[PDB]
Design a protein around this ligand. Structure first.
Ligand SMILES: [Ca+2]
Ligand SMILES: [Ca+2]
Ligand SMILES: [Ca+2]
Ligand SMILES: [Ca+2]
Lengths: 360, 357
């Protein structure tokens, strides 16, 4: 009764039924009063929120971790900055989970490199968390849903989802670690032989990447790039015909590979053009490179992949830049026109790459 | 191979053999420094088609192929072709469980896409960390192989659990945000203990002034630098609340000093050109504090205002202008109408101004 606040009307009646449901599962009046509103009081347990708080000093003492590094991790993960180590502010679970990060430093990694990776993860996970919010809201916030409908629906859904997230995360991480190490193996294997690898094949490789701003100079947001990536893939798939291979969509970019450069430069140019004419998209840029590369599990690795990716990064919006390797590999009668973009030093590569801007 | 770059190989090959690597493996894949590592990251040399995965796991084939495409795996039109690694096929099969729980497939795919992207940037930053640990002065290939083996054996298993911990922290935050939001709706007004604050977010863009893309390693570094600058510049009564990836959050009882701090922060980032430009969004109103952080309407408005702010710009809600009170002692701010009139997830029309010194 005192657990209904200043509420009246539909809202007050909805709250009373929520409190009843909470009280009868064993949540105490004090807990309900301490949590305004108590809508997710039952649901938040499932993600580790027990309504308890901890000081940085207590975490340091109990878990035997460095206090200064703990605070550096706590802040890098996105927790509130607390300058007083004795102040009981942070949620207990947040403090305990930050403590687990010292292990990476005990096993010999620099505290600075650990912190950097945590920052990157935090950025990425903030985008993933937002998509997860929408997904969950669509399922729970049905029309007319009352506070009790929401409390119960969200509790039921979250209880089933939580056991699935751990395994999913590791699986997606591992997928990326495999790709990253396969890229690395092929790198060193190309540089030891100097020349081709076994299985290798002459390919022309292009990445076509959406730029992160509109023509007016606005920022194309992260959730909008998610939706546009799927639209870029549909489009690349429609314009892509043999002998052009549409390999994969990564981020807001598509990867195309071809034995021969002519039909590919052609497909990339067409692709940049229909994006330019569709006002839903920000502009597209593309980088192209030719050479010897090997394929594992349907993907392509090697120098032309490395070069194409870096050349895509330095291309201006609406522009198709190509390494000299691509124009040399063009043989006969073509109708592209070429401007010399100049020699350019690219980040992961050494031998200054000569670039050409390409147009119909 | 003959001499001193050969006794080098001797060391490696003998070790590789003792790591359970077979003679055939040692050449079916040339210079073999990382063979002993594949099994620890889920690669056992097995490969399965989309259809065989569909019936191994009893899942829908079309949805499976869609999730596989969304995560950034090679596109395979033929469902009977054996192309993907098994582990890659199986990870995609987990997606149907979320759908069977009542989640929209379109949105599951979308979650999967955004998470794959976030984790690819994480892996790139991990590549440099690993290369810094392993590649030490005078490193022979055996050194590099043993180094990789220890790293992947001891460190990699801690990564999944660490990323789940990071995600749960943010899911805890989210649930507080959604509770406070529902609380405001039900009451039709701010909640008990609510305080009058001005909130600002300052966000780095994904590109520098010339349109180039910031790498993942560079992103982590710059985010740390922004955190440092915000720390240097934020003094009482302004509070530096947190850094979430590449954005900082400032909160203050009074709008004038917060606004002065935000402007200064954007200015300074605009003098070093290694930084992408900074942009900021500001709102004023009532908010509740939990765990050092702030929750409520002005936090949600300022966040969405930052999202529509242009590079180099501080965009403020009308709420801030009213909070300054058209009798402000401290007001050497220039005001121009700007920005959109609508914001995603925020009820009515909204009035925005660009502020400069
Ligand atoms: Ca309890
Ligand atoms: Ca982009
Ligand atoms: Ca940003
Ligand atoms: Ca951000």
């Amino acid at each position: 009764d005192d657990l209904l606040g200043d509420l009246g009307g539909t809202a007050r009646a909805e709250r009373a039924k929520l409190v009843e449901w909470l009280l009868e599962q064993g949540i105490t009046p004090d807990e309900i009063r301490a949590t305004n509103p108590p809508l997710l009081l039952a649901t938040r347990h499932l993600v580790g929120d027990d309504g308890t708080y901890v000081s940085a000093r207590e975490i340091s003492e109990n878990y035997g971790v460095d206090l200064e590094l703990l605070q550096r991790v706590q802040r890098a993960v996105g927790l509130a900055r607390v300058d007083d180590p004795d102040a009981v502010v942070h949620m207990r679970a947040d403090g305990e989970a930050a403590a687990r990060a010292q292990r990476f430093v005990e096993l010999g990694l620099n505290p600075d490199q650990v912190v950097l990776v945590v920052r990157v993860l935090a950025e990425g996970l903030s985008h993933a968390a937002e998509a997860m919010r929408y997904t969950a809201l669509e399922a729970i916030m049905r029309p007319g849903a009352t506070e009790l409908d929401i409390a119960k629906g969200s509790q039921a859904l979250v209880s089933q989802i939580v056991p699935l997230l751990g395994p999913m995360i590791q699986d997606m991480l591992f997928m990326q670690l495999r790709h990253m190490m396969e890229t690395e193996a092929v790198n060193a294997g190309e540089r030891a032989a100097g020349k081709p690898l076994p299985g290798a094949r002459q390919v022309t490789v292009a990445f076509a990447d959406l730029v992160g701003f509109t023509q007016l100079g606005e920022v194309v947001s992260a959730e909008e790039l998610g939706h546009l990536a799927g639209r870029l893939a549909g489009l690349a798939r429609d314009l892509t015909a043999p002998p052009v291979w549409f390999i994969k969509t990564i981020g807001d970019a598509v990867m195309l590979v071809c034995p021969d450069p002519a039909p590919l430069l052609d497909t990339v140019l067409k692709l940049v053009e229909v994006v330019d004419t569709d006002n839903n998209f920000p502009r597209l840029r593309a980088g192209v490179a030719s050479g010897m590369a090997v394929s594992r599990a349907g993907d392509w690795f090697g120098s032309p992949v490395n070069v194409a990716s870096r050349v895509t990064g330095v291309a201006r919006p609406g522009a198709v830049l190509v390494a000299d390797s691509v124009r040399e590999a063009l043989g006969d009668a073509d109708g592209f026109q070429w401007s010399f973009a100049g020699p350019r030093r690219l980040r992961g590569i050494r031998g200054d790459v000569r670039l050409f801007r390409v147009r119909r």
